[PDB]
């Protein structure tokens, strides 16, 4: 059992994003 | 069993995005 | 069992988007 | 089971969009 | 049982991001 | 049984980010 | 039962960041 | 029962960061 | 019952950091 | 019942840091 | 019932810091 | 009821620090 209240992902005023993630994450990610 | 309240993804004023995600995330991802 | 209340995807004023998602996210993705 | 109340997809002012989605997201995908 | 209140990811005013993540993180992640 | 209040990730005004992460981490992470 | 209040990761006004992390950290982690 | 209050990682006004970490750490961590 | 109040890592105003860490550390850590 | 107040690592105003650590430190650690 | 107050590492204003540590240390720590 | 007060390491205003340690140090390591 999981209870969550209030979630805010990556915030304002950005030049460039490479790879911004929220989750459980099972397996993998490659960033170049 | 999972409960969520007030969920907000990636915020305002952005030049360029490469790869921005919300979820469980199962498997493999590549960003170049 | 998953419950969501007040769900908000990617916000205003974007120059260019490549790959932005809300979901369960299963399998794989390539971004270039 | 997945349940939603007050669901909102991506916001105003975009120069170019490539891959912006709300759903389950299942499979293999490429973005170039 | 797990209970969480007020989650906030990476904050405002950013020139460039490479790799900013929140999660359980099972497996491998590579940032070049 | 776990209870958590106020989670705040990496703070404002950054020239460039490379590898900024929060999570359990099982396996490995590489920043090059 | 475990109770936690006020988690704050790496603070504001930074020229460049390389490798800033919070977690349990099981296995191998490299910053180069 | 266990109780924790006010966790604060590395503080403000910094020219450059390389390798700044908080965690249990089981295995190996490398900074070069 | 165990209670812990105020945890504060490495403090403000610094020209450059290389290798600043807090944890349990089981196995080892290398700083070069 | 056991209570602790104020855990504080290396203090403010420093030209450059190389290798500054706090922990239980089980096995071995190397600083150059 | 036991009450502990103030655990504080090396104090403010240092031109450069190298290899400065607090801990239990089981096995041991190499410094150069 | 039992009480303890003020664990402190080295004081303020220093030209350069090298190899300053406080700990139980069970086992053995090289310091230079």
Curated annotation (Swiss-Prot), chains A, B, C, D, E, F, G, H, I, J, K, L:
The UniProt annotation puts the region (Interaction with PSEN1) at 14-32
Q: What is the effect of changing residue 32 to V?
A: In one chronic schizophrenia patient; uncertain significance
Question: Which positions are annotated as binding Zn(2+) 2?
Answer: 3-4
Site positions for Susceptible to oxidation, renumbered to this chain? 25
Q: Taxonomically, which superkingdom?
A: Eukaryota
Stretches of the chain forming a coiled coil according to its record: none
- Give the result of residue 25 to L, as annotated: Reduced lipid peroxidation inhibition
Q: Where is this site: Implicated in free radical propagation?
A: 23
Q: What is known to happen upon mutating residue 12 to K?
A: In CAA-APP; Italian type
Task: Provide the residue positions that the database annotates as binding Cu(2+) 2.
Answer: 3-4
Q: What is the effect of changing residue 13 to N?
A: In CAA-APP; Iowa type
Recorded consequence of changing residue 24 to V: In CAA-APP; Italian type
Residues annotated as site: Cleavage: 6-7, 9-10, 30-31
Q: What is this protein called?
A: P3(42)
Organism of origin is Homo sapiens
Gene this protein is translated from: APP
